[PDB]
């Protein structure tokens, strides 16, 4: 118990070769079949919500309610959306035609691609393996899924339960870390969706080139939060939204607030408002125990039993504790090694060249930098990689529009964080080293489909026949010259 | 004269670094600037149409009227379309929202990506270097272009003329073959558009992974033509369209008729109709000379002065002459080595395992296979790579729809060939080993742009705040349970 079986290398081609045949044999082509399968994955989630929450707790130490909001309900809404709008999404589109081809009958049809690979990640292990899967299967593909090994209990359970609802020839499973994942990537797929680090994204895309496979890459970077000096009266909402977005999963969220850029005059009030938000959300007893101002008979036991989630492993814990040395610990600072607990920490007087402000934090550390004018914002943000998310807290329509226009990022949100990702009708995806492609809803269906142009002509005379057919007469030249 | 100067490896980073700065300095951001630049490229083409036709003749031995129809006028129409619809295309789109986020203000903005690399190919050297370029610049990118070295005169002239209209810091030039092109691909770009072979596409995409650069890959394969037994009365139109599509560029066109699949009873009538179409288009004197039934004082001279185009080099000539040994020469067969002339040839009694029916022909050889029923069509077509183009000649609504549904290809055309590629309002691109991504018009602008979601919220209470913020109370659990 605890982990899934590492898939044998001999079986990895067998698993992909079976899904190939399935796709080829029309296993998931017809709309009746796609809806059954999308319904069976709704049952998987709805009937075992309890067990999944318990599994995701053992891996992440997330609370059931945190998990319900962040994973369970977004996956229910995705299944609902895709069944409701499938008949809309399959149907051909009449493009607007211009010039000669406007006399013809033209059409954009959507057709499946074939076998899709989903490679997943540990921080939201169900959501980030199944939400891609729903989209692939909604578009008439068959699929192979590779769960993160850094959430073994969630990989174990899903491996246990998924084949009771959906057959392995329709949705295949491969478990393991680097070796098992390198073997699968040697196999031919028609689209790969990958979530993870840019470093590993380069190796996937290198694998994808072997077979010319289109990739959708869901990556990270340092999502900035810009706070201006028009939010004074709302500072408690600004603080609670930014602190919520960081507290969730102990910061280990790709769209979380990575650092803040605050207008020089609003620094003190934001920081203090973040500290009160923090205290409200983590609760008094918890922070006293972590700090050591209150003793408990079984300290390790108590932290493992808390509402606050853990860091994934010892290496990322230590990395995050060394980032504290890149500034002044204004708020927080508290950690415990044996339960991989690091409470949210706000750092001031940042050396902007320190690793904490060069690499993605992906943890509870939140640096706070200031800006006197808009151009100091732009040299901070645009000197770095294009981030997955950009956040602006402001009531000024000029200041918001000016920051949008002058920066590039996966998404912008004005006056909140994170929630755009759950929003029905927006694509979710990066740009530059935050990624390429997008998915969710219509955009997963569009991503996992080939848009196929179809032109219908008759056998009768039309404009084009005056100039196309050789021989190239002098009369044909004088007609074409007259156009130029 | 003849060729451009091979770009020095020391200058290749300098050239890309200059376009980077340009993009970064807003060289092509504002709409006034993009339209000037698109107008200056209209002037480039319009004012030097003559010289380009002469250059493209020396490389391809294509007639000025062939070139005007296939390259000059499609590039004029593209410039036209992009200036006319730019103000449409820049504008944000209001996606349809559902659930919670429908209370907010949501938006899809389009923003430039940065520096775009266009790698070109020899067979339509101007069209397939500039049409990508127009789309990149219409989307607010700056650009680097790499002309095929297998059309040196067209590369020379464009290198001569392009910087007189548009500055090198806005549109950079790199000339050379394998070495120069490997050096450029070591540099960072924000999108690559490549036209060429799937073999070399894999090496480009491998380069693109180094920097996580999104690729649009414009490739080939064997575009089938399916002829049924409902076209008897129209056989002269069917034959002249298929023979036109092959005659152009001596077959060296990625969307040309590669082979035919004819219903068993219509074989003789199609083949003979293709032979009469061939004779009509290439003219009697030409074919007699080529065959040797009519002599001329300077044979080599006469063929170099003809309207029929040449094979790119000796290697592809010999390859195409060995394909004649994969069947019976029903129509044609005639060749001359010193002018790299191979007249269109129809082969019957094909060994379907012979290289002529395994690899892309890209030449004047046209195999003809038969089918008794629809499933014989499907095992021919679907046993091979997904092709760029699929063509169906038919008047039966059931037979057409059945072939569309059961095959995958870059585009379908019913009752013609090639022209879909010039059609305003369809995307042009492949699928599988015919390619990924699409361009032309709106679709080039969409390809060379990041679609950026933007969510705007207010600071007041809303649906989401009932469940998101910790601490995780029992009252918060009972609210979330009631939803499940
Ligand atoms: N935008 C999103 O949807 C999203 C969501 C979650 C996380 N992320 C990003 O993920 C990033 C990194 O998380 P991580 O570093 O724990 O990811 P990771 O290292 O766990 O990688 C993810 C997947 O890649 C596989 N992998 C690891 N090394 C490999 C190799 N050498 N070859 C092949 N496969 C390999 C793993 O098995 C795993 O399934 C974060 O920085 C975050 O920003 C993005
Ligand atoms: N769909 C389309 O738009 C389209 C249009 C024209 C041609 N094509 C296809 O492209 C192919 C054209 O033939 P081709 O094979 O002569 O193209 P090609 O081999 O000349 O490749 C195109 C470009 O790649 C470069 N190149 C060649 N080898 C390289 C290497 N090792 N590293 C880096 N760069 C390299 C060349 O300099 C050239 O500019 C055909 O198969 C045809 O079907 C497709
Ligand atoms: O790390 C990346 C990531 C991406 C998407 C996530 O899914 C959410 C779905 C719905 C909602 C939220 C989040 C927050 O509020 B929602 O309504 C969570 C994490
Ligand atoms: O081999 C690949 C390829 C790709 C695109 C081509 O450009 C065309 C543009 C416009 C038109 C056509 C063709 C035919 O009629 B048109 O008006 C030609 C060849």
Author numbering:
A (entry chain A), B (entry chain B): 6 to 489
Paper lines:
Part of the initial identifications suggested a specific SAR between the function conferred by an individual gene and aminomethylphenoxy derivatives, mediated by the methylamine moiety shared by the compounds. This gene encodes a protein, TbALDH3 that potentially functions as a trypanosomal FALDH based on our crystallographic and biochemical characterizations. The monomer structure comprises 485 residues from A6 to K490, and adopts a canonical ALDH fold that is composed of an N-terminal NAD-binding domain, a catalytic domain and an oligomerization domain embracing the second subunit of the dimer. Interestingly, this C-terminal structural element strikingly resembles the ‘gatekeeper helix’ that is unique to FALDHs and is involved in regulating enzyme activity and substrate specificity. Moreover, the difference in MS between M1 and M-A1 correlates well with the transition from aldehyde (-CHO) to carboxylic acid (-CO2H), as well as M2 and M-A2, suggesting it is highly likely that M1 and M2 are the aldehyde precursors of the carboxylic acids M-A1 and M-A2 respectively. These data collectively support the notion that MAOa-TbALDH3 can metabolize the aminomethylphenoxy derivatives in a stepwise manner, i.e. the methylamine group in the structure is first converted by MAOa into an aldehyde, and then is further metabolized into a carboxylic acid by TbALDH3.
To understand the reaction catalyzed by TbALDH3 at molecular level, we obtained crystals of the aldehyde-NAD-TbALDH3 complex. A micro-reaction chamber was designed to serve as a physical barrier between the two reactions as well as to minimize the reverse reaction; meanwhile, a cysteine to serine mutation (C259S) was introduced in TbALDH3 to entrap the hyperactive aldehyde metabolites by abolishing the nucleophilic attack on the carbonyl carbon of the aldehyde. The NAD cofactor is located in an extended pocket rendered by a Rossmann fold. There are two hydrogen bonds formed between E365 and the hydroxyl groups of the ribose of the nicotinamide, establishing the key interactions between NAD with TbALDH3 in addition to an H2O-bridge that connects the carboxylate group of the nicotinamide to Y444 and T200. In this structure, the benzaldehyde benzoxaborole substrate exhibits distinctive electron density, being nestled into the substrate funnel and adjacent to the nicotinamide. Specifically, in the catalytic pocket, its aldehyde group directly contacts the catalytic residue (C259S), and also connects to N128, a residue whose counterparts in other ALDHs are involved in the catalytic activity by directing the carbonyl carbon towards the nucleophilic carbon on the nicotinamide. Noticeably, the position of the substrate is relatively flexible as indicated by the B-factor.
